[PDB]
Amino acid sequence: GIRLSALCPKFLHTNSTSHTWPFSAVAELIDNAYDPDVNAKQIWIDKTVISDHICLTFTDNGNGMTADKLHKMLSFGFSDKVTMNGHVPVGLYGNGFKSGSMRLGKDAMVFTKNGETMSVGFLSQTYLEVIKAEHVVVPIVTFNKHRQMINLTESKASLAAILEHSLFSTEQKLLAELNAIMGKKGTRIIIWNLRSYKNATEFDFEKDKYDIRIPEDYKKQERQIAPESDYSLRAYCSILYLKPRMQIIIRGQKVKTQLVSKSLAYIERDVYRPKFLTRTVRITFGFNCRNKDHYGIMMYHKNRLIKAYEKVGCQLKANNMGVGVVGIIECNFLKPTHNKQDFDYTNEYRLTILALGEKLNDYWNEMKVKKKRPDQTWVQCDACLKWRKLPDGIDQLPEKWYCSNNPDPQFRNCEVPEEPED
């Protein structure tokens, strides 16, 4: 007889507010793909246009979801991920898709295939405002591996809802996006109605077409000359994971993970042994040669980057000391905050910080003394003979390929003029 707690549509905006830097939101989406339940090898992050709307897409060749699983995904607080074979999931909070998408845009759509069924979910503020819902409802539609509808009562309503208020006005439009997931399994997330200032999306797609970038008016708030990670998605993704297991392809072009050994010079390894912990924690210190002024600690949690370039020890004390020193550590013990761009400011965190400085200071004192893009790929439509640009990371195409089966929305029929090469 007791009442359920309820979600206002207004909340969807609220959950977003933690993300003050857009990449944090993006990172959450990536994280969802990386995590062992999904297990995707590659995720493709793209900018495109649909129905006259600029969109952000995240597509992955991971496991996909049951229609039920999708609901949790579109619900708050549900997370059931467990480490598999040393592959530790990043996500435990149950909020990341929701906080992230919504930071990125007002409306979002999810298509997934688990190889037994295919489902579509809607999470739109615009929708919710328009029908003046008092509750967050997430429509979902489901199919049987033949383009046959099932779970009919829900789908029927949901579909009507989607068709009317969604970007995709017809089943055909829906299926295309479903179709853009090439494998038997995977998920495509489309986000539209992105945030804008003065009639321009907050993101800059123009300055570089192989990146998603934050325009200069760019320094993240904490910093005083900006490392790349702050304004280039690609640059960021390079360092996103300590030991990558997934391929991040942005704008059709692969992302090349940095390696420390290439990355750092004079490498030394140090250990952290606080009383409160039963296990040792390794650290690596190096001098940063490529950059000359990106330095500080890099803190990883569960193999993900929480914060970077965190100054410590002497570096804090004066600008003059400590330069070019870079530290890498992983703290599973610490707890990520809401946006996952920091840690809860506990005693243990403070202690950890305190140590890093001492250790880094130790390092600096000893060693002070001592001192290209890959080719694009194209496919040729077997009907019209046109050449269509393709994105990296595709293991194998089908024998015959047509403009109509293009995952890219913008070039999906052969009427469309062929793209110039660079």
């Binding site: 192989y210 790929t377 194209w378 040729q380 195409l397 024998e399 660079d422």
Partner: peptide, 10 residues
């Protein structure tokens, strides 16, 4: 099917 290749230039 057929697959070309090309330079991507900064």
């Amino acid at each position: 099917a057929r697959t070309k290749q090309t330079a991507r230039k900064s």
